[PDB]
Structure 1
Amino acid sequence: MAVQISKKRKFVADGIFKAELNEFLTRELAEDGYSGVEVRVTPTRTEIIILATRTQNVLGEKGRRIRELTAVVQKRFGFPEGSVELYAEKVATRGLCAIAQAESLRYKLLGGLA
């Protein structure tokens, strides 16, 4: 790449990428039990694993919403088309995830019980 950006701001920019992406998927997938992301960033490929609880709900009917989430991520970050792929994976022992249980308790409280 002839833009040739330095390593110091490179790792910082990757961190800001994961921060904005984490908060974006937090506001998107909170109904699904979103617990986090892990970006397996290959050269020429980029897998981006979402870890949540209701993977069918985060996937959608025929996978529509995960498609449009891939389109959103690619069009926002200016990625090459088809370079990134989102992947829904269910967390093991979802009770022991403090994030998913906090979101569950959040949706219970706005459900309205004591």
Structure 2
Amino acid sequence: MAVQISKKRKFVADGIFKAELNEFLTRELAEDGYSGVEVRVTPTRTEIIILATRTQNVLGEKGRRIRELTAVVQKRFGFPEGSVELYAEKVATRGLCAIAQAESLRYKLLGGLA
């Protein structure tokens, strides 16, 4: 469990994790009104705050979907087991959330409408 990479390379690898996730999620939560993330490492724990407008469809019945998502990250980036902890968040004021407004227009259009 060591040593540790250069300080220059420390920020690049964080950016790669911040970015990859942000396109991983957008290909699954598109219909659930995705709006971004906000990551935070905390003492001996990861927080990944999965911002979307409707937390209902994200959660699922018995929390199945949130359980799938946590198990994915736990294998993919090779995280130490049980350190990963997801959280959800609902945003209030949804018309300043351009990302979600654009992706909502998409499904309105692809639904078949003028």
TM-score by length of 1: 0.95
What's the secondary structure of 1:31's corresponding residue?
Answer: helix
Is the counterpart of residue 44 in structure 1 residue 44 in structure 2? yes
| Distance (Å, rounded) in 2 between the aligned partners of 1:111 and 1:98 | 20
Structure 1 outlier segments of 4+, above 2 Å: none
Residues 22-50 of structure 1 deviation map (CA, whole Å, 9 limit, x = unaligned): 00011111111111111111131111101
Q: More helix by proportion, 1 or 2?
A: 1
Measured after TM superposition, the shift of residue 4 of structure 1 is: 1.3
Measured after TM superposition, the shift of residue 88 of structure 1 is: 1.4
Measured after TM superposition, the shift of residue 20 of structure 1 is: 0.3
| Distance (Å, rounded) in 2 between the aligned partners of 1:7 and 1:61 | 43
Measured after TM superposition, the shift of residue 73 of structure 1 is: 1.0
What's the secondary structure of 2:87's corresponding residue?
Answer: strand
What do you get for the CA RMSD once the two structures are aligned?
A: 1.0
Q: How many residues are matched? A: 114
Measured after TM superposition, the shift of residue 3 of structure 1 is: 2.8
Measured after TM superposition, the shift of residue 80 of structure 1 is: 1.2
Segments of structure 2 that go 5 or more residues without pairing to the other structure are: none
What's the secondary structure of 1:58's corresponding residue?
Answer: helix
Measured after TM superposition, the shift of residue 7 of structure 1 is: 1.1
Partner of 1:32: 32
Residues 61-109 of structure 1 deviation map (CA, whole Å, 9 limit, x = unaligned): 1110111100001110110111111111111101220001011001101
Aligned residues with identical type, % of pairs: 100
